[PDB]
Amino acid sequence: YEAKLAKYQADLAKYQKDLAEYPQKLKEYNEEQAKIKEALKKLEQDKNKDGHLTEPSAQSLVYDSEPDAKLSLTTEDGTLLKSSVVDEAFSKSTSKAKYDQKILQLDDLDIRGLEKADSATSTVELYGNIGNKSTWTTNVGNNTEVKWGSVLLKRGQSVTATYTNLQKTYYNGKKVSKIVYKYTVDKDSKFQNPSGNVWLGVFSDPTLGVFASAYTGQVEKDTSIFIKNEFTFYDENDQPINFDNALLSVASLNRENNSIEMAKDYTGKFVRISGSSIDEKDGKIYATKTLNFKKGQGGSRWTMYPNGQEGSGWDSSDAPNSWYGAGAVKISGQHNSITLGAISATLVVPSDSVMAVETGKKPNIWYSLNGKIRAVNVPKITKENPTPPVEPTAP
């Protein structure tokens, strides 16, 4: 009868508060549900128009941006890298030209520069356009502040990234407290870096994802880099979330004549976007029938980068037709998995003078997994279904 009564009394005050607030929360839930159901009736009717989900549903996972998240890294077999080693590597070789114009050009980084003698650290040191480089830009965010922990991993090795301090992430209108990703280098990757190392730049904002690279400053024929991504999201009580058809966006699945970006080995259900270059074929999600790099070339409708033409620059976060290189995966359960990578076209499709040339590519990729579904007008669930308050019983 000690803190039993004090607990009961605390829970009674909280009950009284929830009872007072419950009718307004129920009203707001009911109004939002009504809105969502009407938006879904229209999406069903429009399911074959350009940029619409072939199987429309509401987005329960609000997971667009987390600029203020906090990053923690652990690897049992890998090497977390000192910032100053990462900085030195950026200043030399193929990224030097951009580093001298105050730009961190992640896709030009020659990762051999990271393989120095006394490089290891026990905890994450963030690097990016921050501190003394607060006026610098990066090719991934331009002027926006981006930073990452750096790790060297070989085939089969993994890093576990924990992201806390999340300000805007919600599932079914409840706040997400923590996200844990385990990133593993897929053993079947074909990259040639003699050390066997891959650099993962793990951004502090988990919605920006990962920059994965084995680039040594030359292109490679018959190369690939794949990163397995296993993840669990956690609720306000630090418990794993059991997703029920949350939508995961797989965007920027670029296909050029020599290079395919693809997702594979995924949990959940692929949902095609109407009009998109992206489909599923043999458990792999990519541009299956056409290239998507340049209008007219290899069957592509649009041009991936902004050139001036109509619907060009499809490949960015804010472009209206970014769905052209996107798909969605409907996920459930508490533990989910997907593998993202880039591979030489000739390892995937028959050799062909337009669709699959032998020309070498850079074994790198920037990918992201988030809730920013690129299909048009997908409604978000922002209001929780309130649980009727239960009056507690006295000791």
User: Nearest distance from residue 261's CB to Mg ion, in Å?
Assistant: 5
The site for Mg ion, by CB under 5 A, has a size of 3
277 is a contact residue toward Mg ion (CB under 5 A): no
Q: Is 115 helix (H, G, I), strand (E, B) or coil?
A: coil
Nearest by Cα to 213 from 85, 106, 347: 106
Contacts 24+ apart (CB under 8 A), 140-143: 140/106, 140/203, 140/208, 140/211, 140/366, 141/208
292 is a contact residue toward Mg ion (CB under 5 A): no
Question: Whose Cβ is closer to Mg ion: residue 197's or residue 252's?
Answer: 252
User: Nearest distance from residue 252's CB to Mg ion, in Å?
Assistant: 3
Question: Between residue 313 and residue 342, which ones bind Mg ion under the rule CB under 5 A?
Answer: none
Q: Which of 252, 259, 277, 339 binds Mg ion (CB under 5 A)?
A: 252
79 is a contact residue toward Mg ion (CB under 5 A): no
User: Nearest distance from residue 6's CB to Mg ion, in Å?
Assistant: 56
Segment lying near Mg ion (by CB under 5 A), choices 24-32, 42-50, 258-266, 354-362: 258-266
Question: How many CA atoms are closer than 13 Å to the CA of 278, on its beta-carbon side?
Answer: 34
Q: Please state, in angstroms and rounded to a whole number, the distance separating the CA atoms of residues 308 and 295.
A: 12
Amino acid at 135: T
138 is a contact residue toward Mg ion (CB under 5 A): no
Fill in the DSSP letter of residue 99. H
257 is a contact residue toward Mg ion (CB under 5 A): no
DSSP string for 318-378: T-TTGGGG-EEEEEEES-EEEEEEEEEGGGTS--BTTTB----B-SEEEE--BS---STTP
Residues in the chain: 395
Residue with the CB atom nearest Mg ion in the bound state: 252
224 is a contact residue toward Mg ion (CB under 5 A): no
370 is a contact residue toward Mg ion (CB under 5 A): no
User: Nearest distance from residue 254's CB to Mg ion, in Å?
Assistant: 4
Segment lying near Mg ion (by CB under 5 A), choices 127-135, 187-195, 259-267, 377-385: 259-267
Segment lying near Mg ion (by CB under 5 A), choices 97-105, 252-260, 353-361, 377-385: 252-260
Location of structure tokens 């999600």:
285
Location of structure tokens 């939002």:
32
Binding site for Mg ion (CB under 5 A): 252, 254, 261
